[PDB]
Amino acid sequence: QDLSDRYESLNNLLNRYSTLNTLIKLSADPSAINAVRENLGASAKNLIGDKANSPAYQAVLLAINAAVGFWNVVGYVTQCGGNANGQKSISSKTIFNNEPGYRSTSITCSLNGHSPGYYGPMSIENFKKLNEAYQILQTALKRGLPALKENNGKVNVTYTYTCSGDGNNNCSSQVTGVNNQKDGTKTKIQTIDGKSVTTTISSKVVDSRADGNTTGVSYTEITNKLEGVPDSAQALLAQASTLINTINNACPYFHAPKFSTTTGKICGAFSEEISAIQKMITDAQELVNQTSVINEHEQTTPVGNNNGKPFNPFTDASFAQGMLANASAQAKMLNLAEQVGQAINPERLSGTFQNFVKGFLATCNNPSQGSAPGTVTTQTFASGCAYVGQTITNLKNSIAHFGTQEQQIQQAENIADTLVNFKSRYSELGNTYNSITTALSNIPNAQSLQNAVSKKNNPYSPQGIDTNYYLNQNSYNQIQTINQEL
């Protein structure tokens, strides 16, 4: 029906006009602009300062927890071994402590006679990288991640591994840097995400014939102590990225609710899962990058002239570019947070990926009130043990409860946009008036509805707003009825 598409289009334009009219009025009133600025500063505080209630916080935590939890699921089946520099070995057993091994709190790398590499055992050089990122993330998680505003917190992280078997060179002087492998230390300054961290490495050899040594073989124990490791969102996301990308780059052989595939290469059988976790990390990294835009454009100073001069939007609005940047960056943090959520939420997935997330990644086999984050037990293997299911919930609920601020963010965006482009938006209001005036002349027997909009010149405006635009409410209500009837 022609006449019905007419009335619909007219109703929609009248609504548009009315909203644009209001936006122009708001943008010329410092008391309204100040209330919206105050709201914008308070939402920024919430996003960057809060934890439980911040979708930004929840999204970062979720990206990190997914990467740790992915390793706790698949680590026990992933093959590793060999000697230094990625060389095959004859009899090298290298054990990494506080790792989610098969019925163990260590992972044993003991694949002899095959060269490490793609579709083979992970090299010890790569396992070391993976294990250091893992231990940093688990220590940080156990203690609790700080609010996004707190970018200078520090944590100390200690871990140990052992080497046994004839010819194992993975704990030798040359590899570790100690003066003496039997009883030795080395301290250095290590760079972690651009920060200087003090690293202490210690080496000792435990003889098969030493007291308390119930293994009956002799072995080297390496301890690594990192002091002052950054625990910012940015830094922890970089560790998560190293964890996942090391797994992907090494693409190791594995052999094993059950997995869809029980032998293969990790980057093949778990490619869908890796894909999601890389995207989650990357979106969280971009979310955290918005923080500096928000922090650069503070909303604390009231606007308008403080001496007597009426506010002129054409000339008194140089704050608006900062306000638009702030509001847009908050909008973007919200959108990205939701994208991190949607990548992993089992409600949105199907097939083997849904099963991987519900039956493995989002559960914890640890005995209990649940175990604390960052805990590795002899049962961890095959389950995420990283609060993944609860963090998915907490991210959903923080986004739904951020609706108040989400509206305030949009209001600030619209108003700062209008200010930045005031001449052009004021001109669009007039062009929307012209389009309406045209549509009204092309509806039949509508002689009485021609007043639906009107305007008046005001050459005296102290604000340069020389045309006042009006909506006749009776004509509008009549038009709204006709349109409902079709």
Residue numbers in the entry: 27 to 282, 291 to 402, 410 to 527
Paper quotes:
To achieve colonization of the stomach, this Gram-negative bacterium adheres to Lewisb (Leb) antigens in the gastric mucosa using its outer membrane protein BabA. The blood group antigen–binding adhesin (BabA) is one of the best-characterized adhesion proteins of the bacterium. It contains two domains: an N-terminal extracellular host-binding domain (7–9) and a C-terminal outer membrane–spanning domain predicted to form a β-barrel structure similar to that of known porins. BabA is a predominantly α-helical molecule with a markedly kinked tertiary structure containing a single, shallow Leb binding site at its tip within a β-strand motif.
